[PDB]
Design an enzyme around this catalytic site. Structure first.
Site, short mmCIF file in Angstrom:
data_model
loop_
_atom_site.label_atom_id
_atom_site.label_comp_id
_atom_site.label_asym_id
_atom_site.label_seq_id
_atom_site.Cartn_x
_atom_site.Cartn_y
_atom_site.Cartn_z
N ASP A 62 0.85 -1.23 0.00
CA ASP A 62 0.00 0.00 0.00
C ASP A 62 0.87 1.26 0.00
O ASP A 62 0.69 2.15 -0.84
CB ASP A 62 -0.97 0.03 1.20
CG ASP A 62 -1.90 -1.18 1.22
OD1 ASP A 62 -2.62 -1.39 0.23
OD2 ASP A 62 -1.90 -1.93 2.23
N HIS B 256 7.90 14.18 0.75
CA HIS B 256 6.50 14.36 0.49
C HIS B 256 5.83 13.01 0.43
O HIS B 256 6.49 11.99 0.20
CB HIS B 256 6.23 15.17 -0.78
CG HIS B 256 6.82 14.60 -2.04
ND1 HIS B 256 7.48 15.40 -2.93
CD2 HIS B 256 6.79 13.36 -2.60
CE1 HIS B 256 7.85 14.68 -3.97
NE2 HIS B 256 7.47 13.44 -3.78
N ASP C 121 2.11 6.57 -0.89
CA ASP C 121 3.57 6.43 -0.92
C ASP C 121 4.25 7.65 -0.28
O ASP C 121 3.72 8.75 -0.32
CB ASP C 121 4.09 6.25 -2.34
CG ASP C 121 3.56 5.00 -3.00
OD1 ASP C 121 2.83 4.22 -2.34
OD2 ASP C 121 3.84 4.80 -4.18
N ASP D 83 13.73 12.96 0.53
CA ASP D 83 14.72 13.62 -0.33
C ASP D 83 16.10 13.15 0.08
O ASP D 83 16.60 13.46 1.17
CB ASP D 83 14.60 15.13 -0.20
CG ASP D 83 15.48 15.89 -1.17
OD1 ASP D 83 16.26 15.30 -1.94
OD2 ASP D 83 15.32 17.13 -1.20
N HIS E 219 5.54 12.46 10.25
CA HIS E 219 4.84 13.51 9.50
C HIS E 219 4.34 12.98 8.14
O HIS E 219 3.18 13.14 7.83
CB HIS E 219 5.75 14.73 9.29
CG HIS E 219 5.10 15.87 8.55
ND1 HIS E 219 4.59 16.97 9.19
CD2 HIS E 219 4.92 16.09 7.23
CE1 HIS E 219 4.11 17.82 8.30
NE2 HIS E 219 4.30 17.30 7.10
N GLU E 220 5.21 12.33 7.38
CA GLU E 220 4.85 11.80 6.06
C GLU E 220 3.77 10.72 6.10
O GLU E 220 2.84 10.73 5.28
CB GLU E 220 6.10 11.28 5.31
CG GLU E 220 7.16 12.31 4.98
CD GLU E 220 6.61 13.60 4.36
OE1 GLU E 220 5.80 13.50 3.44
OE2 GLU E 220 7.00 14.70 4.81
N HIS F 158 0.26 12.24 6.34
CA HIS F 158 -0.19 12.52 4.96
C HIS F 158 -0.63 11.23 4.21
O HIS F 158 -1.71 11.22 3.63
CB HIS F 158 0.91 13.23 4.13
CG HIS F 158 1.19 14.64 4.56
ND1 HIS F 158 0.20 15.57 4.77
CD2 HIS F 158 2.36 15.27 4.80
CE1 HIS F 158 0.75 16.73 5.12
NE2 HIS F 158 2.06 16.57 5.14
N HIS G 44 -2.09 19.57 7.10
CA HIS G 44 -1.28 20.29 8.09
C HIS G 44 -2.08 20.87 9.22
O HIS G 44 -3.29 21.12 9.10
CB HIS G 44 -0.38 21.36 7.45
CG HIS G 44 0.75 20.79 6.66
ND1 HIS G 44 1.27 21.40 5.54
CD2 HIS G 44 1.44 19.63 6.81
CE1 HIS G 44 2.35 20.74 5.17
NE2 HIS G 44 2.37 19.59 5.81
O1 LIG Z 1 5.17 16.43 3.77
C1 LIG Z 1 5.31 17.55 3.41
N1 LIG Z 1 4.41 18.48 3.69
C2 LIG Z 1 4.74 19.68 3.20
O2 LIG Z 1 4.07 20.70 3.33
C3 LIG Z 1 6.10 19.50 2.53
C4 LIG Z 1 7.16 20.36 3.29
N2 LIG Z 1 7.40 19.70 4.59
C5 LIG Z 1 8.43 18.83 4.84
O3 LIG Z 1 9.23 18.49 3.98
C6 LIG Z 1 8.46 18.18 6.16
C7 LIG Z 1 8.79 16.83 6.33
N3 LIG Z 1 8.67 16.57 7.60
N4 LIG Z 1 8.26 17.75 8.25
C8 LIG Z 1 7.99 17.84 9.63
C9 LIG Z 1 7.25 18.92 10.15
C10 LIG Z 1 6.96 19.00 11.52
C11 LIG Z 1 7.38 18.00 12.38
C12 LIG Z 1 8.09 16.92 11.87
F1 LIG Z 1 8.49 15.95 12.71
C13 LIG Z 1 8.39 16.83 10.51
N5 LIG Z 1 8.12 18.66 7.35
C14 LIG Z 1 5.87 19.90 1.07
C15 LIG Z 1 5.01 18.99 0.19
C16 LIG Z 1 6.51 19.11 -0.08
N6 LIG Z 1 6.35 18.04 2.71
CA LIG Z 2 15.30 19.20 0.06
CA LIG Z 3 0.72 3.14 -2.89
ZN LIG Z 4 7.99 11.90 -5.00
ZN LIG Z 5 3.51 18.06 5.42
#
Ligand SMILES: O=C1NC(=O)[C@](CNC(=O)c2cnn(-c3cccc(F)c3)n2)(C2CC2)N1
Ligand SMILES: [Ca+2]
Ligand SMILES: [Ca+2]
Ligand SMILES: [Zn+2]
Ligand SMILES: [Zn+2]
Ligand SMILES: [Ca+2]
Ligand SMILES: [Cl-]
Length: 158
Positions: free
Chosen positions: A53, A78, A89, A93, A113-114, A117, A123
């Protein structure tokens, strides 16, 4: 947005960052999934063959989806919300330096965080939330989801 219409969810690590030991990568990811499974009915299983998944990928630059990574700094990772194919998925980076603690960017915290999503969360405006847009390191030994995070995920999954 959509939710996963099933409680047993699989993940596969597509490829490993050379930044960390493979066991540390496995551990960070497993523990990240555990954070979310502790507050929901969702069960996460690592699989080593076939289509999962949630595919976990380390890539740099333009890497085959609509959204290129941007070198060291800025975007760390992301992920895609629930659905088939690329849905769910989580892409990290490779231009970042992934670490077990705060030496570079912490993989565990990023993965929490990922995965949020991947499960359908957007957010948070709460700076204490793991779903806050701005990454900051916190003591991973005392790590916990905010009230805003738990409400968020339980509204989707009970
Ligand atoms: O997933 C994503 N959402 C976004 O808006 C972007 C930018 N943010 C980041 O790259 C990112 C990754 N981890 N965190 C994080 C933040 C707060 C606490 C923590 F533990 C980790 N922020 C964007 C879509 C490219 N990516
Ligand atoms: Ca980067
Ligand atoms: Ca998938
Ligand atoms: Zn990608
Ligand atoms: Zn995010
Ligand atoms: Ca790297
Ligand atoms: Cl470290």
């Amino acid at each position: 947005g959509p939710v996963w219409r099933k409680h047993y969810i699989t993940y596969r690590i597509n490829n490993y960052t050379p930044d960390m030991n493979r066991e540390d990568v496995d551990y960070a990811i497993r523990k990240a999934f555990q954070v979310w499974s502790n507050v929901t009915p969702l069960k996460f299983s690592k699989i080593n063959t076939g289509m999962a998944d949630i595919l976990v990928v380390f890539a740099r630059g333009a890497h085959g989806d609509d959204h290129a990574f941007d070198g060291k700094g800025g975007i760390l990772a992301h992920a895609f919300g629930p659905g088939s194919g690329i849905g769910g998925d989580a892409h990290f980076d490779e231009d970042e330096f992934w670490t077990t603690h705060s030496g570079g960017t912490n993989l565990f915290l990023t993965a929490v965080h990922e995965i949020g999503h991947s499960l359908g969360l957007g957010h948070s405006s709460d700076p204490k939330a793991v779903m806050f847009p701005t990454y900051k390191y916190v003591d991973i030994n005392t790590f916990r989801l905010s009230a805003d995070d738990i409400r968020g995920i339980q509204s989707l999954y009970g």
